[PDB]
Design a protein around this nucleic acid. Sequence first.
DNA 1: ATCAATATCCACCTGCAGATACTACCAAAAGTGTATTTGGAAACTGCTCCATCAAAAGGCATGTTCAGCTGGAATCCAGCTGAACATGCCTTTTGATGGAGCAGTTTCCAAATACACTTTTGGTAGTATCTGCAGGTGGATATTGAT
DNA 2: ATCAATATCCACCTGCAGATACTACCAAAAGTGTATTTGGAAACTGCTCCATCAAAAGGCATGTTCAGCTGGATTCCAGCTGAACATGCCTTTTGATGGAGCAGTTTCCAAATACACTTTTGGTAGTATCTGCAGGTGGATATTGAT
Lengths: 97, 94, 82, 86, 99, 99, 105, 106
Amino acid sequence: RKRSRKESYSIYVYKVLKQVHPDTGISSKAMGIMNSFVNDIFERIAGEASRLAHYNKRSTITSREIQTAVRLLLPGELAKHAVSEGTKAVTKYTSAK
Amino acid sequence: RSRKESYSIYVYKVLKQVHPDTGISSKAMGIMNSFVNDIFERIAGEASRLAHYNKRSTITSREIQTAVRLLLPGELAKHAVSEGTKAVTKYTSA
Amino acid sequence: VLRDNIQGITKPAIRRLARRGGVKRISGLIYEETRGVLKVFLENVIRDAVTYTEHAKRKTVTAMDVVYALKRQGRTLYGFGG
Amino acid sequence: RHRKVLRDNIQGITKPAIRRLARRGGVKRISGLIYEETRGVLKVFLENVIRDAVTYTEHAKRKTVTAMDVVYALKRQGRTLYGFGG
Amino acid sequence: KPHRYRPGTVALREIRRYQKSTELLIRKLPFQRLVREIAQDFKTDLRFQSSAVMALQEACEAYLVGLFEDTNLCAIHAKRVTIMPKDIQLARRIRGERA
Amino acid sequence: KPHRYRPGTVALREIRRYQKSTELLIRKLPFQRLVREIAQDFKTDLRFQSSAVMALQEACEAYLVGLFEDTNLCAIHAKRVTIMPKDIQLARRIRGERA
Amino acid sequence: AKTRSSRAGLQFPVGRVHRLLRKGNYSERVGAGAPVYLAAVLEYLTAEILELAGNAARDNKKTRIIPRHLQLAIRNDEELNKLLGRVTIAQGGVLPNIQAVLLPK
Amino acid sequence: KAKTRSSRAGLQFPVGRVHRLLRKGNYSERVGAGAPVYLAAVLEYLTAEILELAGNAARDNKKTRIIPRHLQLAIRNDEELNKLLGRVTIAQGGVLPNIQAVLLPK
DNA sequence: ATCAATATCCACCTGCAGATACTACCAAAAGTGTATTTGGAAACTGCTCCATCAAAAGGCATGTTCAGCTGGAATCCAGCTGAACATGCCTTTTGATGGAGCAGTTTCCAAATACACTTTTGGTAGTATCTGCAGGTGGATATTGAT
DNA sequence: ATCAATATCCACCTGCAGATACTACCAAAAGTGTATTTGGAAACTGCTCCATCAAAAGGCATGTTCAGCTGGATTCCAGCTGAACATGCCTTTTGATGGAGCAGTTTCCAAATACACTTTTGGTAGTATCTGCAGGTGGATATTGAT
Ligand SMILES: [Mn+2]
Ligand SMILES: [Mn+2]
Ligand SMILES: [Mn+2]
Ligand SMILES: [Mn+2]
Ligand SMILES: [Mn+2]
Ligand SMILES: [Mn+2]
Ligand SMILES: [Mn+2]
Ligand SMILES: [Mn+2]
Ligand SMILES: [Mn+2]
Ligand SMILES: [Mn+2]
Ligand SMILES: [Mn+2]
Ligand SMILES: [Mn+2]
Ligand SMILES: [Mn+2]
Ligand SMILES: [Mn+2]
């Protein structure tokens, strides 16, 4: 019998680490902290996006719900930078295919 | 125009059971409506997480019950569980 | 007169709030301190309320906007819908 | 066989352990009555978290309390914990 | 001599009076002015439902009253009966609203 | 002739030491026994993943350290350097843990 | 045709509670018993508050429950006060309470 | 040949996975195609921000490997990350060195 | 100030736990393409209720005076609590073993969803009557504070 | 003790805002019945990891002594903050009056879901070899406290 797969953000967290600090490593416990962080923020944003949609009688969560959720959830400068990165990623995504 | 649902007529119904000669102002009815909506959301919310945690796609009376236990303080939980079990039994036998 | 709007929250009104809070004696510096705290509270709630207004593409801040804002700030309010 | 009866283990939270925790909390001087007060406060905290954790365990029809049981319990009490599978 | 209650006597009378009642204690129009002014900094040309402003004053007054309770306990902790800025600051810090 | 540091010198040394490190400060086996004792009173025949016990200890110690911080501020507010039961109680009251 | 509420012995609307669960995005599926159980819980909690609030009204020589009475009932009740510890009742005011050290003589 | 939605969006974080997690999470009936793109980018950005500051803390401590202590230093020394994670406990993170001034000797 | 006792620093080192590397493997995940369905943006409009305006009226904020009593400073001292020491217990560490019970696989049906159809009900809108209690009264008496 | 100035309470009264009882209208909601589908319990069982044991030992807990300096008590008085009162400023009221814009309706298409099929990938497993740093040492520098 095979133990079923346990997904995590580790390889993606690790990629970002090498971008910002090419010669810096990360312990497995620290990576455990980072994985909890990403899961936590995911749920917080998704949760707020969910409520936002429901409040406005919409059945679809779009990038617009995510954006408003990010503004509600994140403090000043973090929200500003998150919004620009999110907006950039979406426009670039649609500009292709 | 349109219609706005609320728990008003059901709250009023319950009021006459417990206090036949007692009325309730509209403002107080508003607070009761807020109350019912709030507790609904809390219980449904916890029941949702419970199902998700256990990789189930169905919220059953069992999830509602565990949610009730998690959310209500001691004696309120005991009686709520009792009332909940009572109504599911009576509903089944019909 | 040309007074700031926050200064419209008067010493006697703040006194009354303190009295309901069970306060018997009040330092002269409390009133300015209270105004600053009050403003931060309002800024935080109104910011969120308006953010709900904007998302709904409205120009009118509704009670539900405020109720939703208060809830996510952990100041759940009964009596105005929801 | 069954293990020895468990009792009075709150006293296992010793005076030096409590002093150490207070030091990390920046405390310089400590009254003699603090130690019993801290044990009581700790017991209440532990009881509350364990109660919720076991409630999750029971709902899953398990006999073993998992780290996730504890994590979920800490979360719903607003003591979110990172590092154990969140 | 004309009549004078001792300092503290009327204060206690007021505490009993306002703890008995539920009416809002800030004047409506100045509060409405404050709200519109703050909201203008986030988005210009807004309108408010009347109930939106009322919900704001109910929440705000309830918050300050509760804060004043904690503040009062902080003053009494320091063996005073007079609340001070440092009492409010301590209460807010332990509440986690700051620092 | 034998050397003695003044009262408070070593206490300050200890604060700097433990604020620098991250290791758990409660002994492991006694804490596990407390967890098992408390759980057993809620439900018999429970077993624990070892990581479940550790998650409980990390959470418990973080809570107490944070509580001692608030407690310290309450003592200092009363112009004391010594934390007392009433400092803890005031902190927990304002936190809303016993309000 | 007989309602699920009457079938379950409840005043609270089982059908509406079920529809609310389905549209609330809580889960893919909702069991039959779930809205019955939940409806019963909400009705009981409602009864408990109205009972204590009604009592508060009588104590104040009133026959109509107003927000003040709901607040008195909730804050004077240990478990309800805990359940609603982070909730504000509009026009509820506070409990009469003066710290002993502030009393004269 | 097939390009991943991540590469198409210019992202390191997995867009496909984020989309799946949104659908399975019972957040809404429908999920727009832009939603997981925007969300993955935000998560990736916040990850970058924490790792930048944590690596710096590691460096300040003459270490090349980030451990939970460095994550805690980075978060609690940054006002906005501290606010965002104000109700979060970092296991083995410890606390910031901080002695109240009145406790120091004269 | 001098100096001695002790903690703190930093360089240097080595063992190794834990991080890294690589190949194999595969179910699930992910993407591509096609057909089909539809949420909600857009334009237009009716009608709710929001902003503003005038217009008194008096309630309530403000400024001033006076001093009661509170906060804070200063002084004393009893004894709590920190620092250091001796003693030895019990936690920690290491390793092993049985087996509880968590978890993976497959089978199978009670109960779920999905429509179509029919019946009921809660929200509503006028319309009219009713009534709990706020607010005002007088007059009894309780509280407060001066003697 | 008395005595006077206010506050506070109780009984009663009455206008009206807001609660009630009425009929009537209707779309959405709820029930009912049939056909289809599938989530997850039951059974079986592989295999992780939890409980328990042993056995050595030193890190750390316990209990004690001693006295530094803290907390608590006392006293004092400067001045801040409460009470009272005279102004008059502006909030409150309400009733009408445009009209912004919320919200309801219809249209219709970009973007959603559903599905079949193909490719890709991240997770696990298996061993096998680096490597950052914990922890130990020794010796120079720094800090503290007595004099
Ligand atoms: Mn026991
Ligand atoms: Mn449509
Ligand atoms: Mn004087
Ligand atoms: Mn004093
Ligand atoms: Mn078995
Ligand atoms: Mn009807
Ligand atoms: Mn009256
Ligand atoms: Mn199946
Ligand atoms: Mn011993
Ligand atoms: Mn002495
Ligand atoms: Mn002192
Ligand atoms: Mn218009
Ligand atoms: Mn691969
Ligand atoms: Mn080292």
